[PDB]
A paper describes a structure:
[name] [name] consists of the soluble F1 and membrane-bound Fo subcomplexes and occurs in dimers that assemble into oligomers to induce the formation of inner-membrane folds, called cristae. Dissociation of [name] dimers into monomers results in the loss of native cristae architecture and impairs [name] function. Here, we report cryo-EM structures of the intact [name] dimer from [name] in ten different rotational states. Although overall dimer architecture varies among eukaryotes, we find that subunit-g together with subunit-e form an ancestral oligomerization motif, which is shared between the trypanosomal and mammalian lineages.
Using masked refinements, maps were obtained for the membrane region, the rotor, and the peripheral stalk. The nucleotide base is inserted between two Arg82c residues, whereas the triphosphate region is coordinated by another five Arg82c residues, with Tyr79δ and Asn76δ providing asymmetric coordination contacts. The β-barrel, which has previously been reported also in the [name] from E. gracilis, extends from the c10-ring approximately 15 Å to the lumen. The mechanism of proton translocation involves sequential protonation of E102 of subunits-c, rotation of the c10-ring with neutralized E102c exposed to the phospholipid bilayer, and release of protons on the other side of the membrane.
Residue numbers in the entry:
A (entry chain I): 11 to 75
B (entry chain H): 22 to 182
C (entry chain G): 2 to 280
D (entry chain V), E (entry chain U), F (entry chain W), G (entry chain T), H (entry chain X), I (entry chain S), ...: 41 to 118
The structure:
């Protein structure tokens, strides 16, 4: 609705919807469903020193959108 | 050197009916309900499927015209020819309807309405309403509105039956 | 004195190595058992994605014709010991070297292998901790990063491993053209008698708005990426099992060799000492 | 001069004019049913509801036509 | 003066006006079938039901037409 | 010269013309009870609110219908 | 007094009015075929049933037009 | 030669014509409530603002209708 | 009294009214072709059948047009 | 001969005709608002620009209506 | 008594009534070209064929208008 | 006999008829703006451009009304 | 017996009836430009092309009105 005007893409909207739906699940089943929405992905580039410089091209969590 | 394409390993193709061909009266619809590259139903024959699209609800019966529907967070009903109703809830995705008698509903998340609970939705809605006032900026407000809409749809689906 | 001690010490080391590898085998077998359920539930999500993107095309014209960035998103595993999957992916990438090539690999091994070989064609890589199930959010992250790497990109080629069977892991490709080229092809299919299999699909897409079409495009690209990563994970597990079994066999052979040498050394030393002492 | 005139054949003309109202009535009815079909082809499970509402519409537009008809009779027998 | 006059020919004009009601009725009927097609293409499996409803709509619109015709036949033959 | 006439029968003709005002009125109602159906299929959960709004629109159109009917009756019994 | 006047030409004007009904006939027919095309574009394999239903609708609307023509010819030859 | 005639009944005819405009008003109202419902189905969250805008449109259309009705009534009593 | 009149020019009036029928004919044709284009936009490979059906509908409407024209010619040349 | 006649009540007729010009005006306004609602449902963030354009359209349509009403009042006072 | 009255100014009314028929031809052409514009955006690759079909439809509507003008001129002169 | 009759009030009637033309013009203008809204809510980035075209259409459509209005004045001031 | 009457003021009625035809032309132009505005928002890249076709329609829709307008003069100045 109003999220398009702010530049939020469709995929982020889908991720938010799925996260909310999982949060609405019963206590017992959530243990499974929550495994399909927890962010565990990151962007890295190897620098000269060897440190894995982390990129900020795309937000990982929904609150950062 | 010619690499394959991942679609060659999937032999369950899509049957598209030709333009200049005779009509057939179908009594069942082949449904294919999918969540994150995983199906719950595999070409299951059903009497009808009710899907809540963006413009409005669609009641798909055998022989429906070819169409593409952009789903919204909402319930999805499947009624078999036997007379048994199965209700899911979806958070998003697409529905492809074919005039040959097939309906492929590919959702990001499709979970049984029973699995959902009421009090959890109410408390999450209250928390989102409280956070809306403290939204950092416009984007946070839009995100909280999205979450609130999803929760309201879930609660309405639960209260309906 | 020294020979026997060294042989026994290295034999003990090999024994510990074998035990560690056996534990690794058991853990990987548990993971393979958990992940094998996908096979029943696959090969049905991507049906209209085929119509959206499946196109029998030459491997030369599609490459030379483009004059904008050609993004490549090879799928690679975080941990080694998988086998020849990463090597084959690297070979496939090398065969497709071009001035327009851009790499956004996935996995630590892919990053470490494409950073050195291709420094000027590498921007950054994505990493996922294999803690949760491969979900849609990860695919969306990959797609968003790919777009931000090169928004004016001719195509986005995903290279992954397809797990045909327990012992067969081929290399598969998903090609994701730019929105403009996809729109042109879709319009040609809808109007012209050519592409007769996509005529209804293209006409259905055209009837709808443009935002819906763009959302459809992004959604099916994400689905393709999700399928790729899932198949790559399954293939990685299978190849890890195979390579672990091979390593176990090699370790057992080396332990047998060392035991034979230890027996020979002890007998030789005992007899030599006895002869030179009491004779 | 003060010529009071009573043309007896005019009460036909007015009657006909009243009947023209039915043109906007019948057409309206069609529209309802038209949409009804499109509403049934979208959510057939709701037909038993929609039909009632459609009937209600016909029960209102028709009630309008009667009024016109009433005039078309009052002027046709007076 | 009191000049009553009986112009016979007027009983034709009114009749013609009544016929104009058929302009609506006809159109309305067409509209129904129009939508019917758009419905029968959308969900052919329901054609039968839709057809019945379409007939119902016709059976109503034509009814209005009857009244108009009656008026005509009640003024042409008068 | 100075001349004046009083044609009584004309009081019918106007009464007919006012009746034509109902042609739109009835049609208008149809439009409402058309879209209502299309609205109830898309959002069956909102049948009550849409029905109330349709009743409101029907009353608003009936107001104009009664205005025209008042004009017609006044020109009929005058 | 009462004055019976038998005008001859008034049997023409009414005729010309009845023909106006055909305006609401032809348009309706157009509508039908219009929708038909759209239907054949949406469900082309269902062309035969749509064609037959459109023919039925055309027959009914043409029957209405034939009634109007009956009235027109009755007045023209009267 | 000069003949000045004051026909009294004509003031009825015009009055009726002034009422015909009401149709174009009444139909319009339905159109508003024909689409309002759809909007309420498309975006139920805006059930309030859309209602106010529709009321504004109805008020303007009713102002037009009253402007016509003033002419209708002035000629009925003069 | 017993009286009888015959006006020569009235046969013009009716003729014109008959021509008004064509207003509902030509428009109808446009409607058809309108929809035709839309159909040809979403089913380019089914153009021949759509064109044939459009021609059929045009001829069917032209039948009504020719009926009205025949009435007009009968009232203009006699 | 060279006869000349002036009729008094004719200005009531023409005036009424001008009032019919307000039928398409009011209807037009409704149409605007109709579409407006749909637009506000499709793009709810544009609740003010669309309102401004609707007001502009109403102003132009009302200017046309006032052009007609000027004639309607002027003939009524001639 | 018998009166053979020949009014010399009645052909203007018939000519105007016939000219009214162009209100349908113009609207039909407008509908044709509106649908043409809608279709070209939908499927721009077929612009030429759609243009040809629209030209055909316009030619047919213009033929109808030519018939109406033939009647109008014939009445105006004859 | 042969009488050169000159009626004076007729110039009102014709004038009123001309005003009926505006009933279309007004309506047409509304249609434009209607679509304009549906076009601004479908691609707001083009709003300004769209607005310009809309104005152009008005400046054309309005012109037609002026023609009709001119005729009215010519007959109303003669 | 044979009586010849030459009414001088009847050309006003015919001129107004001819002017009535401009309503259809205005409505057609409005429909054309509304469809243009809708289309451009769907395929902006081709806007210019669409515009040309729209103008063509106007060129082919205004001309008809001219003919009607022409008749008006041919009766207003005669
Ligand atoms: O201005 C417009 C025009 C059209 N559309 C959109 O274009 C599409 C045309 O779709 P259709 O007209 O072909 O189908 P439909 O009546 O079944 O539509 P739905 O109920 O399924 O929506 C529909 O999805 C409509 O919402 C707009 O969103 N805005």
């Amino acid at each position: 609705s109003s999220w398009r005007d702010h530049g939020i893409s469709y995929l982020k909207y889908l991720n938010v919807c799925t996260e909310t739906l999982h949060s609405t699940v019963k206590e017992s089943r959530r243990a499974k469903y929550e495994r399909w929405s927890k962010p565990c992905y990151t962007a890295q580039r190897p620098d000269g020193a060897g440190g894995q410089e982390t990129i900020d091209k795309v937000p990982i969590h929904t609150k950062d959108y | 050197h010619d690499l394959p394409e991942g679609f060659e390993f999937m032999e369950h193709k899509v049957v598209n009916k030709d333009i200049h061909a005779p009509h057939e009266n179908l009594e069942t619809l082949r449904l294919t309900l999918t969540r994150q590259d995983e199906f719950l139903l595999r070409e299951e024959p059903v009497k009808c499927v009710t899907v809540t699209g963006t413009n409005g609800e669609y009641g798909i019966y055998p022989g429906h015209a070819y169409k593409i529907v952009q789903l919204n967070p909402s319930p999805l009903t499947v009624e078999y020819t036997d007379g048994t109703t199965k209700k899911y809830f979806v958070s998003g995705g697409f529905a492809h309807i074919n005039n040959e008698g097939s309906c492929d509903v590919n959702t990001v998340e499709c979970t049984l309405l029973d699995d959902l609970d009421l009090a959890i939705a109410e408390k999450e809605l209250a928390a989102q309403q409280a956070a809306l006032g403290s939204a950092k900026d416009d984007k946070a407000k839009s995100v909280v509105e999205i979450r609130i809409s999803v929760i309201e749809a879930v609660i309405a689906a639960l209260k309906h039956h | 004195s020294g020979k026997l001690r060294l042989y026994k010490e290295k034999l003990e080391g090999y024994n510990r190595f074998y035990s560690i590898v056996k534990t690794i085998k058991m853990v990987t077998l548990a993971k393979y058992r958990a992940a094998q359920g996908r096979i029943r539930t696959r090969d049905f999500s991507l049906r209209y994605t085929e119509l959206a993107f499946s196109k029998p095309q030459a491997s030369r014209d599609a490459v030379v014709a483009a004059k904008n960035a050609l993004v490549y998103i090879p799928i690679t595993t975080n941990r080694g010991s998988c086998g020849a999957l990463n090597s084959n992916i690297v070979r496939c990438i090398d065969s497709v070297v071009s001035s327009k090539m851009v790499l956004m690999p996935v996995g630590k091994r892919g990053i470490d292998s494409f950073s050195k070989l291709y420094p000027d064609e590498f921007r950054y890589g994505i990493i996922n901790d294999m803690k949760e199930s491969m979900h849609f959010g990860y695919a969306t992250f990959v797609i968003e990063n790919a777009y931000e790497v090169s928004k004016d990109a001719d195509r986005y080629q995903v290279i992954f491993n397809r797990f045909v069977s327990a012992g067969v892991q081929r290399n598969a490709v998903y090609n994701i053209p730019s929105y403009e080229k996809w729109k042109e092809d879709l319009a040609d299919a809808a109007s012209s008698d050519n592409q007769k299999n996509r005529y209804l699909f293209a006409n259905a897409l055209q009837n709808e708005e443009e935002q819906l079409i763009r959302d459809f495009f992004d959604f099916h690209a994400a689905l393709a990426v999700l399928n790729a990563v899932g198949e790559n994970e399954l293939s990685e597990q299978a190849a890890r099992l195979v390579a672990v079994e091979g390593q176990l066999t090699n370790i057992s052979s080396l332990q047998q060799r060392t035991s034979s040498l230890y027996n020979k050394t002890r007998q030789f030393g005992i007899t030599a000492a006895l002869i030179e002492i009491l004779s | 001069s003060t010529v009071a005139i009573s043309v007896q054949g005019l009460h036909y003309v007015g009657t006909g004019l009243a009947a023209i109202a039915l043109a906007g009535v019948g057409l309206g009815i069609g529209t309802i049913f038209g949409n009804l079909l499109v509403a049934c082809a979208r959510q057939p499970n709701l037909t038993k509801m929609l039909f009632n509402y459609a009937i209600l519409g016909f029960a209102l537009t028709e009630a309008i036509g009667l009024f016109a008809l009433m005039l078309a009779f009052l002027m046709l027998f007076s």
